[PDB]
């Protein structure tokens, strides 16, 4: 196959997983020191779709509004995932408890998943792709990407 053909096939596969919201090959566990985490129940291969980071897709005005509210309730955790798309700031706000798994994945700078922006007809999605083969039984991890001094002072596990 050509590069265009393989890319076209990958896009179709990914669009369809985003539609179904199918989250196979994963389960929730408790991981010492982290809270809940998500562990693989099957081997994933490098390059595979793992899960969408699924939540409320919002723009900056609402994101800033919600941040100001969440900061007032300390039982609210940190589930807002910011990105740029078409010169604008977007956020997948996964603060609300749902059954979706992406929002439960913990942080490592040396993890096994990589977040990508995947556009379907001008709607952006954040998806996690396996950055290496992932063993059955191992925790899914990705780099949260907040390196700010203010964050790491308060959340030193961000440093690694």
């Amino acid at each position: 196959k050509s590069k265009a053909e393989l890319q076209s096939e990958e896009r179709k596969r990914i669009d369809e997983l985003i539609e179904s919201g199918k989250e196979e090959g994963m389960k929730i566990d408790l991981i010492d020191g982290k809270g809940r985490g998500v562990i693989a129940t099957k081997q994933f291969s490098r390059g595979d779709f793992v899960v969408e980071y699924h939540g409320d897709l919002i723009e900056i005005t609402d994101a800033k509004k919600r941040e100001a509210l969440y900061a007032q309730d300390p039982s609210t955790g940190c589930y807002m995932y910011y990105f740029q798309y078409l010169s604008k700031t977007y956020c997948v706000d996964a603060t609300r408890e749902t059954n979706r798994l992406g929002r439960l994945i913990n942080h490592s700078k040396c993890g096994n998943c990589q977040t990508k922006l995947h556009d379907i007809d001008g709607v952006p999605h954040l998806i996690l792709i396996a950055s290496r083969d992932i063993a059955a039984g191992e925790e899914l991890l990705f780099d949260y990407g907040d390196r700010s001094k203010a964050s790491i002072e308060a959340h030193p596990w961000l440093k690694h």
Binding site: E67, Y70, A71, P74, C78, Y79, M80, Y81, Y82, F83, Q84, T115, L117, L126, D143, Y144, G145, D146, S148, S151, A154, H155, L158
Partner: peptide, 8 residues
């Protein structure tokens, strides 16, 4: 007291 997630 809150951190974010940011795409890089």
């Amino acid at each position: 007291k809150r951190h974010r997630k940011v795409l890089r």
